[PDB]
Design a protein around this motif. Structure first.
Motif, PDB file in Angstrom:
ATOM      1  N   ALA A   1      -3.047  -0.467 -13.938  1.00 23.62           N
ATOM      2  CA  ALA A   1      -2.242  -0.395 -12.723  1.00 23.62           C
ATOM      3  C   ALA A   1      -0.967  -1.224 -12.921  1.00 23.62           C
ATOM      4  O   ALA A   1       0.134  -0.767 -12.618  1.00 23.62           O
ATOM      5  CB  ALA A   1      -3.041  -0.920 -11.533  1.00 23.62           C
TER       6      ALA A   1
ATOM      7  N   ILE B   1      -7.806   1.768  -6.562  1.00 28.45           N
ATOM      8  CA  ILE B   1      -6.575   1.000  -6.464  1.00 28.45           C
ATOM      9  C   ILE B   1      -6.110   0.851  -5.023  1.00 28.45           C
ATOM     10  O   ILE B   1      -6.038   1.831  -4.280  1.00 28.45           O
ATOM     11  CB  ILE B   1      -5.435   1.664  -7.274  1.00 28.45           C
ATOM     12  CG1 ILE B   1      -5.794   1.677  -8.763  1.00 28.45           C
ATOM     13  CG2 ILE B   1      -4.114   0.927  -7.029  1.00 28.45           C
ATOM     14  CD1 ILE B   1      -4.761   2.377  -9.611  1.00 28.45           C
ATOM     15  N   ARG B   2      -5.793  -0.381  -4.640  1.00 27.62           N
ATOM     16  CA  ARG B   2      -5.317  -0.684  -3.296  1.00 27.62           C
ATOM     17  C   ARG B   2      -4.070  -1.557  -3.381  1.00 27.62           C
ATOM     18  O   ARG B   2      -4.007  -2.497  -4.180  1.00 27.62           O
ATOM     19  CB  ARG B   2      -6.405  -1.408  -2.499  1.00 27.62           C
ATOM     20  CG  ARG B   2      -5.957  -1.898  -1.123  1.00 27.62           C
ATOM     21  CD  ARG B   2      -7.113  -2.543  -0.371  1.00 27.62           C
ATOM     22  NE  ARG B   2      -6.665  -3.210   0.848  1.00 27.62           N
ATOM     23  CZ  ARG B   2      -7.460  -3.882   1.673  1.00 27.62           C
ATOM     24  NH1 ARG B   2      -8.759  -3.984   1.416  1.00 27.62           N
ATOM     25  NH2 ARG B   2      -6.954  -4.449   2.761  1.00 27.62           N
ATOM     26  N   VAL B   3      -3.076  -1.246  -2.560  1.00 31.66           N
ATOM     27  CA  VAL B   3      -1.845  -2.018  -2.560  1.00 31.66           C
ATOM     28  C   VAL B   3      -1.496  -2.528  -1.164  1.00 31.66           C
ATOM     29  O   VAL B   3      -1.479  -1.759  -0.202  1.00 31.66           O
ATOM     30  CB  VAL B   3      -0.649  -1.181  -3.088  1.00 31.66           C
ATOM     31  CG1 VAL B   3       0.612  -2.038  -3.111  1.00 31.66           C
ATOM     32  CG2 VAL B   3      -0.956  -0.639  -4.486  1.00 31.66           C
TER      33      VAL B   3
ATOM     34  N   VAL C   1      -3.309   6.616  -2.631  1.00 31.47           N
ATOM     35  CA  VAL C   1      -2.138   7.457  -2.808  1.00 31.47           C
ATOM     36  C   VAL C   1      -2.026   7.980  -4.238  1.00 31.47           C
ATOM     37  O   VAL C   1      -2.106   7.209  -5.195  1.00 31.47           O
ATOM     38  CB  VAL C   1      -0.830   6.692  -2.464  1.00 31.47           C
ATOM     39  CG1 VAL C   1       0.369   7.621  -2.623  1.00 31.47           C
ATOM     40  CG2 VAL C   1      -0.898   6.140  -1.038  1.00 31.47           C
ATOM     41  N   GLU C   2      -1.867   9.295  -4.365  1.00 32.05           N
ATOM     42  CA  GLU C   2      -1.704   9.958  -5.660  1.00 32.05           C
ATOM     43  C   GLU C   2      -0.272  10.497  -5.709  1.00 32.05           C
ATOM     44  O   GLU C   2       0.046  11.469  -5.029  1.00 32.05           O
ATOM     45  CB  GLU C   2      -2.680  11.133  -5.796  1.00 32.05           C
ATOM     46  CG  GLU C   2      -4.156  10.775  -5.884  1.00 32.05           C
ATOM     47  CD  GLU C   2      -4.532  10.060  -7.173  1.00 32.05           C
ATOM     48  OE1 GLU C   2      -4.025  10.449  -8.251  1.00 32.05           O
ATOM     49  OE2 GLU C   2      -5.348   9.116  -7.108  1.00 32.05           O
TER      50      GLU C   2
ATOM     51  N   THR D   1       1.753   0.250 -15.000  1.00 31.33           N
ATOM     52  CA  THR D   1       2.473   1.367 -14.395  1.00 31.33           C
ATOM     53  C   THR D   1       3.292   0.955 -13.175  1.00 31.33           C
ATOM     54  O   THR D   1       3.911   1.796 -12.530  1.00 31.33           O
ATOM     55  CB  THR D   1       1.508   2.485 -13.950  1.00 31.33           C
ATOM     56  OG1 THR D   1       0.647   1.991 -12.914  1.00 31.33           O
ATOM     57  CG2 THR D   1       0.666   2.963 -15.119  1.00 31.33           C
TER      58      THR D   1
ATOM     59  N   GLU E   1       6.391  -0.281 -11.732  1.00 32.50           N
ATOM     60  CA  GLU E   1       7.792  -0.532 -12.057  1.00 32.50           C
ATOM     61  C   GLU E   1       8.519  -1.299 -10.952  1.00 32.50           C
ATOM     62  O   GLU E   1       8.448  -0.941  -9.781  1.00 32.50           O
ATOM     63  CB  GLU E   1       8.550   0.773 -12.322  1.00 32.50           C
ATOM     64  CG  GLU E   1       9.951   0.513 -12.883  1.00 32.50           C
ATOM     65  CD  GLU E   1      10.775   1.771 -13.119  1.00 32.50           C
ATOM     66  OE1 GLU E   1      11.657   1.737 -14.001  1.00 32.50           O
ATOM     67  OE2 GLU E   1      10.566   2.784 -12.426  1.00 32.50           O
TER      68      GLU E   1
ATOM     69  N   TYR F   1       8.194   1.429  -8.142  1.00 27.44           N
ATOM     70  CA  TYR F   1       7.166   2.462  -8.142  1.00 27.44           C
ATOM     71  C   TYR F   1       5.801   1.809  -7.982  1.00 27.44           C
ATOM     72  O   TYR F   1       5.408   0.945  -8.766  1.00 27.44           O
ATOM     73  CB  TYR F   1       7.206   3.301  -9.427  1.00 27.44           C
ATOM     74  CG  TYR F   1       6.044   4.266  -9.527  1.00 27.44           C
ATOM     75  CD1 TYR F   1       4.917   3.951 -10.282  1.00 27.44           C
ATOM     76  CD2 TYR F   1       6.044   5.463  -8.815  1.00 27.44           C
ATOM     77  CE1 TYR F   1       3.822   4.796 -10.326  1.00 27.44           C
ATOM     78  CE2 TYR F   1       4.953   6.315  -8.848  1.00 27.44           C
ATOM     79  CZ  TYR F   1       3.841   5.975  -9.605  1.00 27.44           C
ATOM     80  OH  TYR F   1       2.738   6.795  -9.614  1.00 27.44           O
ATOM     81  N   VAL F   2       5.084   2.236  -6.951  1.00 29.87           N
ATOM     82  CA  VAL F   2       3.772   1.696  -6.632  1.00 29.87           C
ATOM     83  C   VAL F   2       2.655   2.528  -7.247  1.00 29.87           C
ATOM     84  O   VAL F   2       2.577   3.735  -7.034  1.00 29.87           O
ATOM     85  CB  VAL F   2       3.562   1.657  -5.097  1.00 29.87           C
ATOM     86  CG1 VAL F   2       2.238   0.991  -4.766  1.00 29.87           C
ATOM     87  CG2 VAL F   2       4.712   0.920  -4.434  1.00 29.87           C
ATOM     88  N   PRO F   3       1.780   1.887  -8.035  1.00 24.50           N
ATOM     89  CA  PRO F   3       0.669   2.603  -8.665  1.00 24.50           C
ATOM     90  C   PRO F   3      -0.389   2.973  -7.639  1.00 24.50           C
ATOM     91  O   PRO F   3      -0.545   2.288  -6.621  1.00 24.50           O
ATOM     92  CB  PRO F   3       0.152   1.607  -9.699  1.00 24.50           C
ATOM     93  CG  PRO F   3       0.447   0.279  -9.066  1.00 24.50           C
ATOM     94  CD  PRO F   3       1.845   0.492  -8.501  1.00 24.50           C
ATOM     95  N   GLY F   4      -1.100   4.062  -7.912  1.00 18.07           N
ATOM     96  CA  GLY F   4      -2.148   4.527  -7.025  1.00 18.07           C
ATOM     97  C   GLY F   4      -3.214   5.298  -7.788  1.00 18.07           C
ATOM     98  O   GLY F   4      -2.983   5.772  -8.904  1.00 18.07           O
ATOM     99  N   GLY F   5      -4.390   5.421  -7.185  1.00 20.44           N
ATOM    100  CA  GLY F   5      -5.474   6.135  -7.826  1.00 20.44           C
ATOM    101  C   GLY F   5      -6.824   5.613  -7.389  1.00 20.44           C
ATOM    102  O   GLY F   5      -6.918   4.772  -6.492  1.00 20.44           O
TER     103      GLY F   5
ATOM    104  N   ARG G   1      -3.587   7.852 -16.095  1.00 24.11           N
ATOM    105  CA  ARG G   1      -4.254   6.633 -15.646  1.00 24.11           C
ATOM    106  C   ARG G   1      -5.703   6.588 -16.133  1.00 24.11           C
ATOM    107  O   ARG G   1      -6.183   5.547 -16.582  1.00 24.11           O
ATOM    108  CB  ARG G   1      -4.224   6.512 -14.115  1.00 24.11           C
ATOM    109  CG  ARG G   1      -4.918   5.248 -13.616  1.00 24.11           C
ATOM    110  CD  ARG G   1      -4.704   5.001 -12.138  1.00 24.11           C
ATOM    111  NE  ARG G   1      -3.293   4.893 -11.789  1.00 24.11           N
ATOM    112  CZ  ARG G   1      -2.453   4.002 -12.307  1.00 24.11           C
ATOM    113  NH1 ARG G   1      -2.873   3.127 -13.209  1.00 24.11           N
ATOM    114  NH2 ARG G   1      -1.190   3.982 -11.915  1.00 24.11           N
TER     115      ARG G   1
END
Lengths: 451, 451
Positions: free
Chosen positions: B405, B365-367, A367-368, B408, B410, B358-362, A19
């Motif tokens: 984000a 990044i906020r979902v 979340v990682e 990535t 999916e 699949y939820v991106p994170g890092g 990333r």
């Protein structure tokens, strides 16, 4: 020089590194074993190659990895953590092949890889270490005099001969005298020397560690400390930043000692100096991981600095445009390791497949992970499913945010550490901010849960 | 008084509200229709009840919902957005039943629900509105004089009679004269009055909106603005905060006008005042949503203030402990709506089931979501799957973080807006920060993608 990055790792860390690269606009190359042909990093990378003759050889074969990088024009390699991350030899080979190893100099990795010797280097650099005898004790009188200046309790232990090797705790001079006589008595009967050593006993210690970051131009800064006292089998489970025992003045006092010592050994890029803290908040250096830390996210949350991205910029030769005075500490961050393991059966791994999987999200939640339905925990690598990190203005709010996130994290098909984590967040002492490396042992109540 | 909260909503917003409550330690109550018996909010709530005789009646039956709250001891109701959120009647009924409606006063909701009338209230409160004729035009001479002071271009339109009702753009006095004559000509032939109105034409407008937040004690502050110009069918797709057209001085100038007007009408809790901005950055009030905004997260990211949690604290009677001077704007945040719809077939909804997810994170990044494998998009409610929000120090970094984000994220089993969003992030003008409400129409190239 970094134009294409080959990630010599896997799992969540490979995703983290990929990333960072994507954000910088740097093409990436992934490697993997056949057993993880559907792994997340494999899908996210621009290029991906299945290599190795066994699950571990995939990531540990130094020459094959260097050759592949050279084959596809990857001029930089990020080792993540574990595997070849702290392999001074691999780092050396990369340099000789013209590949930019994203980490400290191989000589520095070598130096720090020698734990006893590095402790001597750091000591001479002004870094505090646990006080004790300067080699074998000359006599009982010397032991008694040494104990008085370092302060009780102290530890006595034989390092030679066929006498008992168990450590002996001495809480006052009488105990020291009795332990010294018993120890030398056992050595004589074995016809040899005991080579008795004395050391200050740091009881109920906290694991406090400093984040280091420096460019290849002399600027080395620290990003505060992390309290990773909550472990099991010495395996980290919960980490926080910053710690609750250091005040801003002490935070900087030890911080500057850290960066001063780092500069003295020519350290650059990311690194972590691990210490043990006593009940009063005094730190003693133990060792240094010359690589990115698993729990780096909590420091990122409270300082707002992207450590992994900086690793790459620094390896590229860029200057670290952050002065120590610019490093601020805002609020608190907590990280819990979501592992496929049973804490009740002493954390045995659940090598199965995840069925239901819902990732929590919201304000202050990060979340990682590389998981999703179908995610599989093979017996070849770690059992980590995800790293849940929560940030909040105050300690109690961070605790409640974490518990709320954990309570909404659905995962089926495997046992995880979620129930355990939830109980810890509810536990009286943890909420009050009271905990040491022996927290779990002292709270068997957190393992009691519906199941 | 808030001791138990009943969430009169569903989907991602119900999850958002439930999380805020869990963090405050407030038990929650969820409602749902049978068609969503496995919905996320249903699982996350402490109590959950299936009610309604049809998918919409579940959330729109005012009395049944009030009765349930009373039945289970829920003394507060959070309507989220949509449904009964801006139903002044429901808010009134809640009050009369002794239930705390988490939102502004029902009289305020009523007032603002009358768009033409509220525009008059705001105008008199000092809020700028689009200039135009004070009712029907008296003559051509008056129209020519009015146009000169408001500035060209202007709009002429008939509001009575059987003459043409299409709006007529006048770019100079000659066009005005010709349009006025043609319009009055059409009215005469229909034996009636045209009731011609003139209005300033705000061409290629930007949608700029201010976030309002006030307690029930007179403290009303604004949390900056949001640029939600990128829409389709007037449906928001991408939102940012703060905007790129307002400078800090203008941000505060309009901000204070906003809070002054809000205080004048007795507004409390969360609210949004929507404006349209011209090429120079001048704003004109359009309307006000008296509820939480779908895109509230971007404002939270750049100010660090939890809006939903504050909604509850304020409804509980707590004082807003934030002064306007404490409101800072750090970096930029972008939010993209991940909807199950086909942008190529003019965003037709994909009422199917999500397979891979699949939820991106890092970092940054906020979902916000209620999805997972099995998630289903029924034809009864919106097609939103998730709200992806990214934060970064600068505009370009935020853009690149979002694209990384999105690339990535999916999702299979349904078509989504992800490919479209990715192209927008890559588009030259968007990257340069150049865009208006007609951005999509002006960039058909973003709809071209592998599929």
């Amino acid at each position: 020089m970094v134009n294409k990055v080959l990630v010599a790792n896997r799992g969540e860390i490979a995703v983290r590194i990929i990333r960072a690269c994507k954000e910088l606009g740097i093409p990436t190359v992934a490697i993997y074993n056949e057993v993880e042909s559907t792994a997340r990093h494999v899908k996210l990378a621009d290029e991906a190659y299945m290599i190795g003759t066994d699950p571990l050889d995939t990531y540990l074969n130094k020459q094959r990895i260097i050759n592949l990088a050279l084959e596809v024009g990857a001029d930089a390699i990020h080792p993540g953590y574990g595997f070849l991350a702290e392999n001074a030899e691999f780092a050396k080979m990369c340099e000789e092949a013209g590949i930019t190893f994203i980490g400290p100099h191989w000589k520095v990795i070598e130096l720090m890889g020698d734990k006893a010797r590095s402790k001597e280097v750091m000591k001479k650099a002004g870094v505090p270490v646990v006080p004790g005898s300067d080699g074998v004790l000359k006599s009982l009188e010397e032991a008694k005099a040494l104990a008085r200046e370092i302060g009780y309790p102290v530890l006595l232990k034989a390092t030679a001969g066929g006498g008992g090797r168990g450590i002996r705790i001495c809480r006052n001079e009488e105990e020291l005298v009795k332990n010294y006589e018993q120890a030398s008595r056992e050595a004589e009967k074995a016809f040899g020397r005991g080579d008795l050593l004395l050391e200050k006993f740091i009881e109920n210690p906290k694991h406090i560690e400093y984040q280091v970051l420096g460019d290849k131009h002399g600027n080395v800064i620290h990003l505060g400390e992390r309290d990773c006292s909550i472990q099991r089998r010495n395996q980290k489970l919960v980490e926080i930043a910053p710690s609750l025992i250091l005040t801003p003045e002490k935070r900087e006092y030890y911080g500057n000692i850290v960066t001063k010592a780092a500069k003295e050994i020519g350290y650059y890029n990311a690194g972590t100096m691990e210490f043990i803290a006593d009940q009063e908040g005094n730190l003693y250096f133990i060792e240094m991981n010359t690589r990115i830390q698993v729990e780096h996210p909590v420091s990122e949350m409270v300082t707002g600095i992207d450590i992994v991205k900086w690793q790459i910029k620094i390896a590229a030769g860029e200057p670290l445009t952050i002065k120590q005075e610019d490093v601020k500490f805002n609020g608190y961050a907590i990280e819990c390791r979501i592992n496929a393991e049973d804490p009740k059966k002493n954390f045995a791994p659940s090598t199965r497949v995840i069925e239901r999987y819902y990732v929590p999200g919201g304000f202050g939640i990060r979340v990682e992970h590389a998981a999703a339905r179908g995610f599989e925990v093979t017996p070849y690598y770690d059992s980590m499913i995800a790293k849940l990190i929560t940030w909040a203005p105050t300690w109690d709010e961070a605790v409640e945010r974490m518990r709320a996130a954990l309570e909404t994290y659905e995962i089926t098909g495997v046992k995880t550490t979620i129930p355990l984590l939830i109980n810890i967040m509810k536990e009286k002492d943890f909420k009050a901010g009271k905990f040491t490396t022996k927290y779990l042992e002292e709270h068997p109540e957190v393992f009691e849960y519906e199941e």
